Design a protein around this ligand. Structure first.
Ligand SMILES: [Mg+2]
Lengths: 411, 420
């Protein structure tokens, strides 16, 4: 069976492959801004092994997972019932929402010793790793291939996926002269290069020369206004904005209550609290929006509202072992409504090598991988109908048993 | 006709396109090590205009240009007769030849020069070999600028360059001529963070995808090479870590250097070529007969030469007093001629100063605002490689040609030609 130590154990060769991997990263956009310069993103040298069945189980449930959170997001009454500054803020001026999600998974060791797929988190909005993912995927196919080893390292085109979904959003807005807005926190934001890499894909999947305009949120106070008649969002008094691609406040809701397609609109932030994820583990709550429901139940982890088997988590800081009893007695009952109890997962431990900026590589570490599955929707929130499902994507992150980008090798 | 100002003159839009161009560079290896981190390479925002005929004239003469310097390099007595240079001769004299097969890659540089009618002619500024810059950077700038131009609606006028591939294809052919399946290719650098390092790595990314059997490329600094490289006393083959035979030593920038040079590894190129690429020699090739001797390819070469006279008094601004391997202009040329001691006379020559083509472009630099609507003078570099046997003087392989451009103010910037 594939495992990373049995590829190579000469330290001098592993060191030389570290420098090679790192120099490939520096040559292919696997970088971030620091200080302002660029630095490569920490990476595992080789792809970590991962069960084929569970990866397929995670990939297959993504369609269902988007549909559940999309439909929950179309039912504001439901979301409110499941739980204050966000509610205060929240007819609809743009029914069409673009909705991209990353579901995270851990292969978890049940008793018997066999691994089962269990979902760690769902994320939407200012999502990391659209641009980095297809590149790490290529990095690791190259390392593996260069060492002689071998469908077991599945293709990821997640930069393309994002591009194809933005293009479809632009088309649904239906204005040939309209632009796509990339809204960042700063010029050197940690999302900036992933954002730019999305546009490099958008260019090569169109004739149309779609203008993408990169603006910070500070400069947006002067350069974005809303039309008082159309309620359309305008840039520099001249350009209609078809899509606002949020890449990380009064302005934010002025944008949200306008005809531009949001990615996704603010209502989705309410449907992706950890409270809500915990609420979906209660009986009936998935079935309500729907088989896709059973597939979803298989990956859930029962979480109970208000000791080494459990974790006390906050719902939006967490306690393990005897600290759970310590915090339970200590805690005032006002705070009880902000935490929940879940079963602690026994995570799969594998061996790999870790390559970091300005340090020697760490060889033969125990690490636990975490699988992220990407998927996007284009849907209408007044009808609840979906018009577009994007291709799926997938990435991985390993931490010691601070993290590292990785990619799965399907054992 | 194409010119850069008539693309766009909104400063806010030019600024936004600067950041875009720069972020594309950071995403595609147009970077170097600094400080240790990475920084993007300064670039022109748009490709600078360049005459179609002269570019074709430069591309077409490259085959001839490699053949002349290759054949001059096969004739040690000729090179000696044409003359640090004392230190290089001393060495070559210690060495028969253990590896006849040389790999020979050249970059010839050109300026479009304004003759008196007002029309531009191609004139060669320099030839370079050995630790050559811009193998890896060139195809990427080429792609950068095709993208900027295309994204702005403008349009064979921006010719494809695969110079990373070119280098790879020539190393692969060198490895094959050595003929040992278990032999490695050595990349010799000055340091781990050398300015050539990422261009070197990018060559290997191309070498991987033009073969099935993974050729091992081993990256070593020259300091580490003192412990890890020895020569076999029987084969005279160069060995790495007592285990790996080295088929090709790819020099990317001293006793060790000539221990490597006098061994069976293919050099890139061997040290003799450093003697044939002095500026003295380039100046010697401008004298009558000296090109014709190795050869029409000769006339093509004569067209791009600039007469240079060894060691005026009416239009001294037409001339420059250059060093042959620091230079004097205008009335200083007459001043320094009389002043100068005859020891120094053998290290300088007189050439015609070229009146260079000035174009407008925008310059994008790290951590500053872009400089819009500068006058700049572009400089065209044509790449080509050989694989040849120096005992017979026969060539077995000619690589594809490549091309790059660099613009300076009328500090420099990577550019690419738009063929007006
Ligand atoms: Mg004068």
């Amino acid at each position: 069976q594939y495992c990373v130590p049995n590829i190579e154990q000469d330290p001098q060769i592993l060191l030389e492959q570290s420098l090679d991997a790192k120099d490939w990263a520096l040559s292919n956009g696997l970088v971030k801004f620091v200080d302002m310069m660029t630095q490569f993103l920490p990476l595992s040298l080789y792809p970590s092994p991962f069960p084929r069945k569970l990866f397929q189980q995670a990939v297959d449930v993504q369609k269902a997972m988007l549909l559940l959170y999309f439909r929950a997001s179309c039912d504001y009454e439901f979301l409110k019932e499941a739980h204050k500054k966000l509610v205060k803020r929240l007819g609809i001026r743009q029914p069409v929402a673009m909705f991209c999600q990353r579901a995270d998974y851990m292969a978890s060791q049940e008793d018997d010793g066999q691994y089962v797929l269990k979902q760690v988190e769902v994320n939407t909005g200012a999502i990391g790793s659209f641009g980095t993912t297809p590149r790490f995927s290529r990095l690791h196919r190259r390392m593996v291939s260069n060492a002689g080893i071998d469908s077991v390292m599945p293709s990821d085109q997640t930069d393309t996926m994002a591009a194809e979904t933005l293009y479809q959003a632009w088309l649904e807005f239906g204005n040939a002269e309209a632009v796509i807005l990339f809204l960042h926190g700063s010029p050197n934001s940690h999302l900036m290069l992933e954002s730019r890499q999305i546009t490099h894909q958008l260019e090569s999947i169109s004739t149309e020369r779609i203008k993408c305009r990169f603006i910070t949120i500070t400069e947006g106070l002067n350069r974005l206004k809303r039309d008082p008649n159309n309620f359309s969002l305008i840039l520099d008094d001249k350009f209609v904005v078809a899509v606002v691609f949020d890449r990380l406040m009064d302005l934010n809701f002025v944008i949200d209550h306008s005809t531009a397609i949001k990615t996704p609109p603010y209502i989705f932030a309410l449907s992706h609290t950890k409270r809500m994820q915990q609420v979906f583990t209660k009986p009936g709550m998935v079935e309500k929006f729907f088989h896709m429901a059973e597939a979803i139940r298989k990956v859930q982890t029962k979480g109970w509202a208000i000791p080494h088997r459990y974790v006390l988590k906050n719902n939006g800081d967490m306690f393990f072992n005897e600290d759970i009893l310590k915090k339970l007695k200590t805690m005032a009952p006002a705070d009880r409504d902000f935490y929940y109890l879940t079963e602690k997962l026994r995570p799969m431990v594998i061996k790999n090598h870790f390559v970091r900026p300005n340090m020697a590589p760490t060889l033969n570490l125990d690490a636990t991988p975490e699988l992220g599955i990407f998927g996007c929707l284009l849907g209408n929130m007044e009808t609840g109908k979906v018009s577009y499902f994007s291709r799926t994507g997938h990435m991985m992150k390993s931490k010691l048993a601070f993290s590292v980008y990785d990619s799965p090798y399907l054992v």
